[PDB]
Enzyme design. Structure first.
Site, PDB file in Angstrom:
ATOM      1  CG  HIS A  47      -0.531   0.121   2.474  1.00  0.00           C
ATOM      2  ND1 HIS A  47      -0.421  -0.665   3.314  1.00  0.00           N
ATOM      3  CD2 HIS A  47       0.017   1.346   3.118  1.00  0.00           C
ATOM      4  CE1 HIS A  47       0.077  -0.149   4.688  1.00  0.00           C
ATOM      5  NE2 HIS A  47       0.141   1.186   4.456  1.00  0.00           N
ATOM      6  CB  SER A 171       2.916   1.729   6.203  1.00  0.00           C
ATOM      7  OG  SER A 171       1.496   1.850   6.644  1.00  0.00           O
TER       8      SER A 171
END
Length: 215
Positions: A47, A171
């Site tokens: 992502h 992330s």
């Protein structure tokens, strides 16, 4: 997500392993964390490099291994290529939320890179999550590496979960075991913001990484 009291601490010295191999990585409109896994290869989340809502790859930016106090203590490299599993492009699912980025120089020869350990299950294992959270950037005005350790408290066939604190920017942070081996990657908050988690380094994960390492 940050769960209860924040247990993250600032990394004191990013010139030593494993911290020197953990990078602040930038794109056109966002940042993430990545970890060197080869001389010119960074592991992060899918992502971070591909947006399933807009069906768009991220703009290529830069990689700063062991940045601390907004200083590129170990130099920098540019991103040149992305490798994303077909599974992620086609489903957007957490079990495929990993990606590899090639850099223009072999910065991993200078700072080092981490090995990946194929796992089946992790519950009860102590891991460390170190990376570049955005909330600490806002509060300190500096880009620094922050770490926290804890146990994997539950899992399914593909994902591992933990109460180690994370925030946007984390992330792509590796789950590091006690031997500094990568056993998974953090990707998200789960269960309505009460636990964190990400994909384990299962056979499928490792197969993809091995492909990406050869490119």
């Amino acid at each position: 997500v940050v769960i209860g009291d924040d247990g993250r601490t600032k990394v004191a010295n990013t010139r030593v392993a494993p911290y020197n191999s953990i990078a602040y990585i930038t794109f056109g409109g966002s940042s993430c964390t990545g970890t060197l896994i080869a001389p010119n290869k960074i592991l992060t989340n899918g992502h971070c490099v591909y947006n399933t809502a807009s069906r768009s790859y991220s703009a290529k930016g830069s990689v700063y291994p062991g940045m601390n106090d907004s200083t590129a203590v170990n130099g920098s490299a540019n991103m040149t290529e992305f490798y994303v599993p077909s599974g992620y492009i086609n489903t957007g699912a957490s079990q495929y939320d990993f990606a590899v980025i090639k850099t223009d120089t072999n910065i991993g020869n200078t700072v080092g890179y981490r090995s990946i350990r194929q796992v089946t299950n992790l519950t009860g294992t102590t891991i460390k999550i170190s990376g570049y959270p955005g909330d600490k950037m806002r509060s300190t005005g500096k880009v620094s590496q922050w770490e926290m350790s804890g146990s994997v408290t539950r899992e399914d066939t593909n994902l591992a979960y933990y109460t180690i604190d994370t925030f946007s920017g984390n992330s792509g942070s590796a789950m590091l075991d006690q031997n500094q081996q990568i056993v998974g990657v953090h990707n998200a908050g789960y269960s309505n913001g009460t636990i964190n988690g990400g994909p384990k380094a299962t056979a499928a994960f490792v197969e993809f990484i091995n492909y990406a390492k050869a490119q």
